Design an enzyme around this catalytic site. Structure first.
Site, PDB file in Angstrom:
ATOM      1  CG  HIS B  41       1.613 -10.220   4.802  1.00 40.79           C
ATOM      2  ND1 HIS B  41       2.426  -9.288   5.420  1.00 40.79           N
ATOM      3  CD2 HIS B  41       2.156 -10.455   3.586  1.00 40.79           C
ATOM      4  CE1 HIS B  41       3.435  -9.006   4.620  1.00 40.79           C
ATOM      5  NE2 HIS B  41       3.302  -9.728   3.500  1.00 40.79           N
ATOM      6  N   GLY B 143       9.317 -10.363  -1.610  1.00 43.50           N
ATOM      7  CA  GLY B 143       9.854 -11.339  -0.644  1.00 43.50           C
ATOM      8  C   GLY B 143      10.838 -10.742   0.357  1.00 43.50           C
ATOM      9  CB  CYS B 145       7.522  -9.178   3.678  1.00 44.01           C
ATOM     10  SG  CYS B 145       6.752  -8.092   2.457  1.00 44.01           S
TER      11      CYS B 145
HETATM   12 SE    SE Z   1       4.996  -9.447   2.052  1.00 46.65          SE
END
Ligand code: SE
Ligand code: SE
Lengths: 304, 304
Positions: B41, B143, B145
């Site tokens: 993503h 952020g 992730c």
């Molecule tokens: Se994300």
């Protein structure tokens, strides 16, 4: 979102941990530039610890009585010095992995990360607080001594703690990196009193703000209170008195949440008088005092 | 002695964290050998996340649309591949700091360390458990992730988790390093149910053993019980059923403490029926289920 007791990343400190051996005794030291720092009681046997004269014990030791090992590399000792309760071993090699660093003496109520080490090898990392009574509630087994406490500002490691002893009561005492004990403790196997521990009131408030930010709002009440009135209730519950310095330190959290410090105090008052009634705040059934306002802002705004 | 939620030392993983940018979106990747791993993503805008066709979105991307940065070093992308929910970016440079590593898929109830990262820079480290419902209760801001979960065996890092999303309920979901989600979750901004969480019964028992070892013995009762009878009470309290596999895993703690697993179960039963009566165990007002028996032994015997 979410809220966790987070330690600093430990890589910079891992590269500094060495194994220190003098006679039979082995513990952890910290290798920065051309100096190794470790507990002076590395020169003590079990029997020595009962009533050590460190000056007389140290006088029996030459540079070559100290075996300093960094992984498989044995370092050469070209100088030794006692500074308060720490030994400074001058070695011939600058640690290539020396990070930017400072030594700092922290205040009761401030937090830091511990890298728990055995035989100069890191086993783990956790966050804790210097208690108002200058103890820490750590996890320290045999040979953890010389494990260090630190904070990181960007690239700079601020070392604030070196583990020296477990008290008969099961809590932990040690020194700054100049070898001055936090608290009234001495490096001797004798009965020593920590004295009454108190809750770090400013930290609890910081955590209630953290709780509001993560949507845990149930404890927010319709009351307010005064600083005097609050501290009157704090005193009863062995909470540290709250100062205007503390009110100021919470300002940015007051600003984010639109909740006045004194109203958050009134919330705290009612929890102290009524308990939690079997509810939780941020996953805890008790009031948490090991986050500073700085820690809460760090985690809530994501500083690296 | 003493007992703490300890993370693994994070140094080996710090040296692997990179920043990944594709169009406007930036998150963390993991640089091992000549491959960078990150959430797929990273190719999505805010709008894309509502209903992404990752194959069609990925087809608009060439190697040069991916900006991979390790500190100030920008890496060159010479190949890209989607494996389940992760992107594998082949770069021209082997990471010089690549530790010995494995990818592993962990079981519900197992624990691991997370190195919470922002812009490819480490901010902190904490220990947590994969919940029976395959969520984690983390601390993950915008952020974070691509932040990774891991265990360390001596010199070898076993990566088990990559953070991909926060659910509308505030808990966290992600994948193994092959990009298979833990649980029924998808990488899409839609309502998704975690389902009923249960307590990790074997972990709680492990922690009660830890408690006994550190002298917290008050909950030890005069009763015993049966596995069937215990699980009958577990079911009522949304505790995971205890298996003979679990009884076996607790054996070494049974052996150290001279307390039979079934008697510790009877202790647990009464706490579940009677609560804590406002007492604490190892500093907690609730039953803790984020230590495995392996974690308890590690901390109680001091493994590095
Ligand atoms: Se994300
Ligand atoms: Se020690």
């Amino acid at each position: 979102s979410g809220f966790r007791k987070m330690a600093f990343p430990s890589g910079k400190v891992e590269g500094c941990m060495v194994q220190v051996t003098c006679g039979t005794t082995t513990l952890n030291g910290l290798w920065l530039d051309d100096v190794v720092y470790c507990p002076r009681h590395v020169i003590c046997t079990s029997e020595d610890m009962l009533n050590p004269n460190y000056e007389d014990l140290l006088i029996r030791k030459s540079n070559h009585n100290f075996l300093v090992q960094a992984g498989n590399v044995q370092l050469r000792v070209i100088g030794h010095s006692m500074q308060n309760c720490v030994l400074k071993l001058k070695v011939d090699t600058a640690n290539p992995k020396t990070p930017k660093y400072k030594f700092v003496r922290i205040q009761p109520g401030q937090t830091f990360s511990v890298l728990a080490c055995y035989n100069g090898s890191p086993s783990g990392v956790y966050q804790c607080a210097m208690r108002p009574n200058f103890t820490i509630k750590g996890s320290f087994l045999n040979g953890s001594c010389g494990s260090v406490g630190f904070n990181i500002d960007y690239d700079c490691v601020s070392f604030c703690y070196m583990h020296h002893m477990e008290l008969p009561t099961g809590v932990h005492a040690g020194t700054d990196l100049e070898g001055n004990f936090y608290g009234p403790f001495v490096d001797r196997q004798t009965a020593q009193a920590a004295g009454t521990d108190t809750t770090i009131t400013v930290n609890v408030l910081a955590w209630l703000y953290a709780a509001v930010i993560n949507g845990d709002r149930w404890f927010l009440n319709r009351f307010t209170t005064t600083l005097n009135d609050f501290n009157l209730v704090a005193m009863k519950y062995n909470y540290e008195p709250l100062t205007q310095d503390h009110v100021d330190i919470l300002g940015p959290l007051s600003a984010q949440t639109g909740i006045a410090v004194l109203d958050m105090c009134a919330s705290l008052k009612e929890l102290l008088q009524n308990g939690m009634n079997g509810r939780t705040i941020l996953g805890s059934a008790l009031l948490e005092d090991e986050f500073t306002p700085f820690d809460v802002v760090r985690q809530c705004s994501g500083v690296t």
